[PDB]
Amino acid sequence: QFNPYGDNGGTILGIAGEDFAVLAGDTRNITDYSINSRYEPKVFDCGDNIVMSANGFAADGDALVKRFKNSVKWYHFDHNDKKLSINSAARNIQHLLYGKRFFPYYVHTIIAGLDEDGKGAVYSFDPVGSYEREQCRAGGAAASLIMPFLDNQVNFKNQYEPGTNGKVKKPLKYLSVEEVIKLVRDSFTSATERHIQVGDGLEILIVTKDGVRKEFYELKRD
Amino acid sequence: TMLAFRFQGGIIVAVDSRATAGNWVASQTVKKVIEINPFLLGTMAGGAADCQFWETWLGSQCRLHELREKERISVAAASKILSNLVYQYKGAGLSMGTMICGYTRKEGPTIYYVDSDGTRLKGDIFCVGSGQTFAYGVLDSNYKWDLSVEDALYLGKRSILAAAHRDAYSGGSVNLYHVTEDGWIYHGNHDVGELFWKVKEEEGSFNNVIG
């Protein structure tokens, strides 16, 4: 019988700073035990300082990104070139995903950018449109490897103040763009080592008030 | 796990904040209480998207009601919009448990249980979710109509904590609400990470656990 879904592997990672946000993703595209591409980008600038990645089944991921990009274009036409806020984009994507509730997009979606107060924002979606704003989110094949590491290093979970008898927690603080890119690169090198669907290349999109910058790093190709 | 019980001083609503994808803990910070309007609350259990999508939709339908009728929607009418909606999708595979909790002049404090197989029940006490039985165990054995606002808020919080502990698919934090004649009041986000030990020490309970 014809199976309309497939697994193109790969993994994505979104971290939000004080005045910036990053959305990282490996550039490897796979089916079963074969490599399709070593460089197939799946993190896109969608305009209005919103970056988006729909990881899982690439065909559904490309279709969703394509439809959201088109949603941003028509938002400008219908509302006098008004800027689509990250919160408004998130709700719009919920309706895109839930619109196919009974034939879902098999993707974990993450978007990143700045909220209306200029502060770093990351939103994460399940395949059928349930979304949540977070400081931190990993999605895709190696999400189970990366996410607990982010809990520990970004949100300082299970970390207490030395000599306080495990009574005072390590205080939360925003990370610098330099410290965040260190965690992203270490997250992806760790995931590459222990997950067969992760490797080849790492592409990071950084979003500040100035615009969308890109950074590329080599990963192991085995 | 989510509960809502009626008492002397109005309604207590308490929910956990955990989201699961099988045994994978996907989130510990999910908002399972939807603030429909200053007098209406909706609790969310089951399919995250189904609950989240259709209860924000319910809020839109409740807004359209007060525009058309120049009057806040009844808890009965609000619950029945959602129950009549999910009933149209019966057999399609929607997964939703909700309690529509609120106050109006004509009804007073009211709780309606609404689920995805079309069940709609008015009642004083409801516990819904994978850990409903753990919440029932604590809530039922300590519940009285003549509870104080302070004791009712604690029992609701303590009942979620009980379920958060035993139920593998419940936890994260407790979100407390109190609904009065003047509307709903938020009573904070309580992380189980600190709340468990605080309750254990102060109450002397949870003797099953290594102190």
Partner: peptide
């Protein structure tokens, strides 16, 4: 996958 207390 989808998320499901």
């Amino acid at each position: 996958x989808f998320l499901f207390x």
